[PDB]
From Swiss-Prot:
Domain of life: Viruses
Activity regulation annotation text: Inhibited in vitro by GRL-0617.
Quaternary structure and partners: May form homohexamers. Interacts with N protein.
Name of the protein this chain belongs to: Papain-like protease nsp3
Summary of the function given for this chain in its UniProt record: Responsible for the cleavages located at the N-terminus of the replicase polyprotein. Participates together with nsp4 in the assembly of virally-induced cytoplasmic double-membrane vesicles necessary for viral replication. Antagonizes innate immune induction of type I interferon by blocking the phosphorylation, dimerization and subsequent nuclear translocation of host IRF3. Also prevents host NF-kappa-B signaling. In addition, PL-PRO possesses a deubiquitinating/deISGylating activity and processes both 'Lys-48'- and 'Lys-63'-linked polyubiquitin chains from cellular substrates.
Effect seen on changing S164L: In strain: Gamma/P.1
Catalytic activity: Thiol-dependent hydrolysis of ester, thioester, amide, peptide and isopeptide bonds formed by the C-terminal Gly of ubiquitin (a 76-residue protein attached to proteins as an intracellular targeting signal)
Topology of the protein relative to the lipid bilayer: Multi-pass membrane protein
Macro domain ranges (all copies): 1-167
Subcellular location: Host endoplasmic reticulum membrane
Residues represented out of the complete protein: 1025 to 1191 of 7096
Species this chain originates from: Severe acute respiratory syndrome coronavirus 2
Length: 167
C-alpha cells in the first residue's frame, strides 16, 4: 500500500491521473519523482522547468554541479539527484526530443531507467514540447516499465485522449 490517490489502473504496474506532477510530488513526497530532462540538465521549461521552479532553483544549482563534474547525459540515459522539497530523489531521464531531431526509438531505452526503482511518480516522457506522440509514449511505458509507475498527466484534454485510446 502507498499514498498515491485517485489513479486509474491501466495494467498490473502502471497507473495514471490528470494532475500536475509538481502537485503530486508536493502531496505524496514520493521516494522518486522523474524529471523529463535534457542531456545538459537545463531545466528551462515543460516538466523540468516546473519541477525546478518548485525547488526555488535548487534543482538547477545541483544539476550545474553534476554537469561540471560528469559532462552531459546520453539521450536515453538518466542520473539520480536530490528530490529537494518534492521527493527523496529525482531521477532525471532524457527521452528523445523530436523537435531536436532525436531518434524516437531511444524512448524505450529512456523508460528502462525506471526499472531501477520499485515505485516512481513520473511524467509521460518525450510528450509535450519534446514532440513525440503521447499515445505511443504511454504504450512504450506500459510495454517497458515493470516496476510500479504512477503517471501524472497535467493536460486534461490529453489525459482524456490517453484513457479513451488505451488498449
Ligand atoms: C516532456 C514534456 C514536456 C512538456 C509537457 C509535457 C506534457 C505533460 C502532460 O500534459 N506535462 C506535464 N505533465 C505532468 N505534470 C506537469 N507539470 C507541468 C507540466 C506537466 C511533457
Amino acid at each position: 500500500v502507498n499514498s498515491f490517490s485517485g489513479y486509474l489502473k491501466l495494467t498490473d504496474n502502471v497507473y495514471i491521473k490528470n494532475a500536475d506532477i509538481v502537485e503530486e510530488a508536493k502531496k505524496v513526497k514520493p521516494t522518486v519523482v522523474v524529471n523529463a530532462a535534457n542531456v545538459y540538465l537545463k531545466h528551462g521549461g515543460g516538466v523540468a522547468g516546473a519541477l525546478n521552479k518548485a525547488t526555488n532553483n535548487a534543482m538547477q544549482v545541483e544539476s550545474d554541479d553534476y554537469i561540471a563534474t560528469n559532462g552531459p547525459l546520453k539521450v536515453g540515459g538518466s542520473c539520480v539527484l536530490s528530490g529537494h522539497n518534492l521527493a527523496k530523489h529525482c531521477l532525471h531521464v532524457v527521452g528523445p526530443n523530436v523537435n531536436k531531431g532525436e531518434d524516437i526509438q531511444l524512448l524505450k531505452s529512456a523508460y528502462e531507467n525506471f526499472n531501477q526503482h520499485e515505485v516512481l511518480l513520473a511524467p509521460l516522457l518525450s510528450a509535450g514540447i519534446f514532440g513525440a506522440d503521447p499515445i505511443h509514449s504511454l504504450r512504450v511505458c506500459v510495454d517497458t516499465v515493470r516496476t510500479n509507475v504512477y503517471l501524472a498527466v497535467f493536460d486534461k484534454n490529453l489525459y482524456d485522449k490517453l484513457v479513451s485510446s488505451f488498449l
